[PDB]
Design a protein around this ligand. Structure first.
Ligand SMILES: Nc1ncnc2c1ncn2[C@@H]1O[C@H](COP(=O)(O)OP(=O)(O)OP(=O)(O)O)[C@@H](O)[C@H]1O
Ligand SMILES: Nc1ncnc2c1ncn2[C@@H]1O[C@H](COP(=O)(O)OP(=O)(O)OP(=O)(O)O)[C@@H](O)[C@H]1O
Ligand SMILES: Nc1ncnc2c1ncn2[C@@H]1O[C@H](COP(=O)(O)OP(=O)(O)OP(=O)(O)O)[C@@H](O)[C@H]1O
Ligand SMILES: Nc1ncnc2c1ncn2[C@@H]1O[C@H](COP(=O)(O)OP(=O)(O)OP(=O)(O)O)[C@@H](O)[C@H]1O
Ligand SMILES: Nc1ncnc2c1ncn2[C@@H]1O[C@H](COP(=O)(O)OP(=O)(O)OP(=O)(O)O)[C@@H](O)[C@H]1O
Ligand SMILES: Nc1ncnc2c1ncn2[C@@H]1O[C@H](COP(=O)(O)OP(=O)(O)OP(=O)(O)O)[C@@H](O)[C@H]1O
Ligand SMILES: [Mg+2]
Ligand SMILES: [Mg+2]
Ligand SMILES: [Mg+2]
Ligand SMILES: [Mg+2]
Lengths: 489, 439, 506, 49
């Protein structure tokens, strides 16, 4: 073999994209992380995916967890390990000590274990082997200096066999040493780090590939999620800038708005409805949703502000009946607090809900509600995730944002999302004669002509009614206009 | 000789500029860094470049990675070491232990290793040696004081042979000790630190020369990128302020704009199109791109906001046909998210895309898109890289920035790039009679 | 001098000011620092300067570097140690271990080293000793308690001999302990700390004198630079406020501006040109540089924004020919990125270029370009350096600053430099009838009267033309004024109908 | 006093002044002849003939 490094696909969702193909074949891959990061899972899912997708038998070496529990715990993700053992596709090599025993057994077992490991490889014709918690065997009476030789023996032997290995290491500090003894990092050909970062009393699971000897990869951390389908990574940097874009138009739910946008929203576009509290962003959202059900198309409303009941109330008061929308299976509501999870989880819940309802339109009520507490950089990453996903899925997306300050209108978005979105719908309060009047304005459309006027609009039982602009007024954007009055030419 | 210290060129892109000539001849250089920094490559690339560029034979001493893998991993960059081994230009000295190890090697083995090296040096008439992972050999049962003498023995003996060496050392912290035992720094004549700094969930690789005993060098960290062409360093502080300038004018695509600029943009100038969102910077950029193809000149549009298709849609709706420009091979669109890489990588992608297309014009849509999350200093440093490169490459550059606040701009670029910009085109909204008109 | 301890001059640029006279004679000074800080150089340059300037023989004790390398490495600074060794003025004491050595030696050798040094001192009649990397000798198997007794033995004996010694020690952390074993700091009479502080991916070298038993010294860190001339320190706090000041006036290149300054800029003064980008600060600088060469005086233009060629282009577009100025050897352009080095380095390059050209005028385009990324406190320190240096050298200096916000900027300078400068030139944009017109104003001048009017100015091929002020206007400084009209039709030049031509033939 | 928003109701859009006395809070009339009331320091009209 006088070619480059051939990789084996792990079929772990997102991992093969960061690893540019997957783990290098015939080499050892070190997966380190703190307690509860998902190290044991990553090893299990590695062998399972190789069996079910490629018929490549696997050997699982455990040093602490009993084989009974390993199968037991795996049933969470709905995969029977006991079946693959019966089929001889998987062999859980019990290397865990018994409650009784003796000491002064340093590298005595290590030599014996290699023969036990190589045994299962030749016999089961194994191509993949995952060794869980290799550290736990040195946790007898050893130093860094001693661990290095025992590890290099195992790694070198496994490379000779021609088997692709995954090794699990346990950590104490999230950003300290990659491995316990500060040695494992340099013994392994490849380094993978599982992190469970705290910050803000929340948790964010991240995966990083520190190195893969002989190849390239994506540098940096990438957020993943442990679900009922195992590890799920979102390479939000791997998503390419090649989204489909057409000139197909769609109604906004408001006919006058469709005229103001030069014929309606683009089907392949992202719409932003920004305004102060009480302006009526949720109204446009509701209106935008009904129009999808008028053409008998599916759409999803992601609410993070109001409950499921209160949404029905405010909508019915606007005439539109959301009760019928759910019965006809054309509209699906979710409703969940932003504090209920992390942005990595919400991004998945959205993506998951989309594939199970194949929407043609989507409306997330308040992005600003999701930016609550979360850093701007982590939030901006969430936007690109949802935006790009719906963009390449031909789904028209309407997003809601509440500007922190009303009147004066300093910048559309405080978190600066106005450069990511395609169409900007601006709502604002206008102080006219002691009254808080509203004003709608299509701030921009990348492909359409759109109206330039700042038109007022009232709200009633019928819904939004757009009226005339403030032609005879000055400083309208400021929120506190000034009628100059034409005296008179 | 009775003069200054002679250096040996490494031919590594950027390094020889930083080391002011290359690695000093007859001395060992310590290249330390955490896991995945590119030490092994730096050692390999040091020997390879010596053979291919100077016909200087090399000896590679490995202490952990098996010799088969060294050649195997090298194939990624597209260079066959096995041929160099067969030609006797390169000798891979396997010093790695056997899977059936034994005990006590800290006296006869150091002499043995030197003997094997010296024999290898004399046999192949070698001029360069790279010893990979010297830390691994002390990892048996040694202390800092014991490591100091073993290194001092290793360095000095090699110094007598007259061999210019590169030594690889591993760390634990990125900004902690330079080496593992906190001793290797003062034993070596020259120190080089490879850093893989995290920050913001991204990784930035930097190169620093701590000291070159007897000579000068560039001080500080310098960002490098490991690609399919090996380590590529960008000494952004080395490039000189000697950019070429002429009175030649070029069209903007907008005839009336060319009148507003006194006859059009200069060819050797940096144009800045700033304004709030919706003002129409992409429009001016597109119109700037089309005019390049109208005069049958090549140009590159670096887009980081809109997709390739949406760019086509909006352009065609503006009349101009981007599709025809791609067929005639005068216009090339890249399109990539800012979060797809780091600024050290984006700078390279730009530079790489330029040399493969030799453009006459260049437009990067939304610099503010790249300024997402990244610190101000790292962004300004990235600007200098792209700005200075296009100026010296005779390429007219139009850049785009979206001011965070509409109406009340108060500042061209709030990131303050305009100070390094020659021509500024400003766009803004103006409230006229209840209507949003541009200016 | 009013100090209890007699000191010995190191002749290192700046150190004798920080140590208030040099190193105390008969005592030991500990110079410690991390790797590559310049420890060995300081000890080498300490012996060299003693030989060249005072014919004081020196003994160099090396514990790791080979004697041939000491001589080899010193040639970089243009120092022929091989000659000095041959002349018996310098003796390199090799105490370095063996590539084929045993183990265990750090006790009787310490007593033997005493007998070696005392032999070298007596034979060579040495007055200066440098023991480089004394730490490496305890780097065999020793602890802090063992170090204290062995150092004290070495130091005390050297003090008895009457030798002024410099001891080099290595560190791990830049701001942590002073030395490795945390013991050397209290055994020595004097402690000098060399630092290679990182911060912002750049490297800034500082020298600090922690203590001098028996005397005073300049407290705190002071930036130094290693060049082809060795260590160069900038005691930016030792620079006294005693510069010469005259009433002499010089032209600014712009005649109308000279009127606005009551007779032109002062010779011994600092000029600050402020304004938003595009106003024309670079223009005034060019005119300030041309007028010096037009009167046959030398001047240097320090540019940090534009290239050397673009400066030539834009100047020629303003008429003035910079090419001829370089030919006549009256004008010198530097041009360098602020990111190309640190403030300590830039400050030296500027100081160096001045001494190599002896200008009568100096001009630094965009100080705000040097304030990029650098903390305000470090930038201010740089400004004081250049400003103070130019002031005591009778060099007229014109500085440029670009306000980050245009039209309505509430301050002259964001870094608050307006109190260090003597004369402030203000440029700004004025929104008049949908047009961006410029305006110039002499904000302050220390010794003169100067014009108080905010006159607008146009820029053409001929250069800057100063016209009249916006008398019939309010809120000028705001950038977008409000037109009130009490007159404007009032005289000046009435008489309607026919009062002009355009035109004929010539 | 001003009801800035109500999710399920119509609510007054007027910024009406309100007095406080021994009897409690009493809401009165709006500042119709005033601009920039939200600013805090409004500008009157003319109250001419
Ligand atoms: N069905 C599931 N849904 C969601 N999360 C799950 C599910 N099953 C397991 N997990 C998560 O996986 C984590 C455990 O992962 P696993 O035990 O495979 O690796 P690990 O915890 O890193 O190994 P170790 O226990 O040795 O540290 C638990 O903290 C749990 O939160
Ligand atoms: N039945 C109704 N009749 C008249 N106006 C109504 C009615 N219901 C709601 N409104 C108006 O709508 C405004 C609320 O807007 P909406 O409920 O569309 O969401 P929103 O204001 O964007 O949400 P939030 O302010 O909670 O972020 C209120 O200020 C109110 O004036
Ligand atoms: N073809 C390639 N393209 C891009 N990057 C590569 C390529 N090959 C290797 N790399 C990068 O180089 C890094 C490995 O560097 P190298 O193995 O030379 O030294 P090191 O990792 O510092 O040493 P060690 O592996 O002993 O810790 C990998 O993390 C990988 O990201
Ligand atoms: N077909 C069209 N007809 C009229 N106006 C258009 C058309 N397409 C786009 N526009 C105008 O151009 C503006 C968008 O400008 P452009 O597409 O050049 O990018 P930009 O606004 O500079 O950047 P960003 O896309 O980040 O907002 C919109 O506000 C819109 O008013
Ligand atoms: N001609 C020169 N110009 C600029 N810098 C130089 C020159 N010669 C040497 N240097 C600098 O001097 C530094 C080394 O200083 P020196 O060896 O004197 O002390 P040190 O490195 O602290 O000692 P040690 O190596 O024992 O720690 C190098 O980092 C190098 O950059
Ligand atoms: N040949 C010329 N004719 C007319 N006006 C000119 C000419 N050259 C420059 N200008 C005017 O001068 C202004 C630029 O000023 P200058 O370059 O002197 O300093 P500056 O703008 O402060 O520098 P910076 O570009 O760093 O802001 C431009 O706005 C331009 O209108
Ligand atoms: Mg709402
Ligand atoms: Mg657009
Ligand atoms: Mg655009
Ligand atoms: Mg300038």
């Amino acid at each position: 073999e006088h070619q480059a490094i051939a990789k084996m696909r792990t079929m772990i969702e997102g991992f093969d994209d960061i690893s540019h193909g997957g783990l290098p074949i015939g080499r050892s891959t070190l997966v380190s992380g703190t307690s509860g990061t998902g190290k044991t899972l990553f090893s299990i899912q590695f062998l399972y995916n190789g069996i079910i997708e490629f018929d490549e038998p696997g050997v699982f070496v455990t040093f602490e967890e009993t084989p009974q529990d390993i199968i037991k715990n795996a049933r969470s993700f709905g995969w029977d390990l006991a079946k693959l053992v019966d089929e001889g596709k998987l062999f859980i090599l019990d290397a865990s000590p018994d409650p009784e025993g003796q000491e002064v057994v340093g590298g005595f077992d290590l030599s014996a274990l290699i023969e036990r490991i190589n045994y299962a490889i030749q016999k089961y014709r194994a191509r993949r082997v995952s060794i869980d918690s290799v550290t736990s065997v040195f946790q007898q009476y050893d130093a860094s200096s001693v661990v290095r030789r025992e590890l290099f023996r195992l790694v070198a032997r496994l490379k000779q066999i021609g088997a692709t290995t995954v090794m699990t290491t346990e950590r104490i500090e999230e950003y300290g040493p990659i491995a316990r003894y500060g040695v494992e990092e340099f013994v392994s050909d490849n380094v993978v780090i599982l992190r469970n970062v705290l910050e803000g009393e929340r948790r964010r699971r991240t995966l990083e590939i520190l190195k893969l000897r002989g190849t390239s990869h994506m540098k940096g951390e990438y957020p993943f999620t442990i679900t009922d389908h195992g590890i799920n990574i979102f390479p939000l940097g791997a998503m390419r800038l090649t989204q489909r874009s057409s000139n197909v138009r769609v109604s906004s739910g408001v006919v006058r708005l469709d005229e103001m946008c030069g014929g309606g929203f683009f089907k392949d576009s992202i719409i932003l409805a920004t305004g102060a509290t009480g302006t009526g962003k949720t109204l446009l959202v509701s209106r935008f949703v009904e129009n999808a059900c008028a053409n008998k198309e599916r759409a999803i409303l992601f609410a993070y502000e109001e409950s499921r009941a209160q949404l029905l109330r405010n909508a019915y008061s606007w005439g539109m009946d959301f009760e019928e929308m759910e019965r006809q299976n054309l509209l699906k509501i979710v409703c969940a607090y932003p504090e209920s999870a992390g942005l990595e989880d919400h991004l998945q819940i959205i993506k998951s809900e989309i594939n199970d309802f194949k929407p043609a339109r989507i409306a997330i009520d308040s992005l600003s509600a999701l930016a609550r507490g979360v850093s701007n950089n982590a939030f901006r990453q969430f936007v690109i995730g949802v935006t790009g996903y719906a963009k390449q899925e031909e789904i028209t997306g309407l997003f809601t944002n509440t500007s922190d300050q009303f009147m004066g209108v300093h910048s559309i978005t405080d978190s600066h999302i106005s450069t990511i979105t395609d169409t900007i719908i601006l709502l604002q309060y206008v102080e006219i004669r002691g009254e808080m009047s509203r004003a709608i304005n299509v701030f921009k459309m990348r492909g359409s002509w759109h109206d330039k006027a700042i038109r007022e609009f009232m709200i009633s039982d019928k819904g939004p009614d757009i009226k005339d602009s403030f032609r005879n007024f000055e400083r309208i954007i400021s929120g506190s206009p000034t009628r100059i009055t034409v005296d008179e030419k």
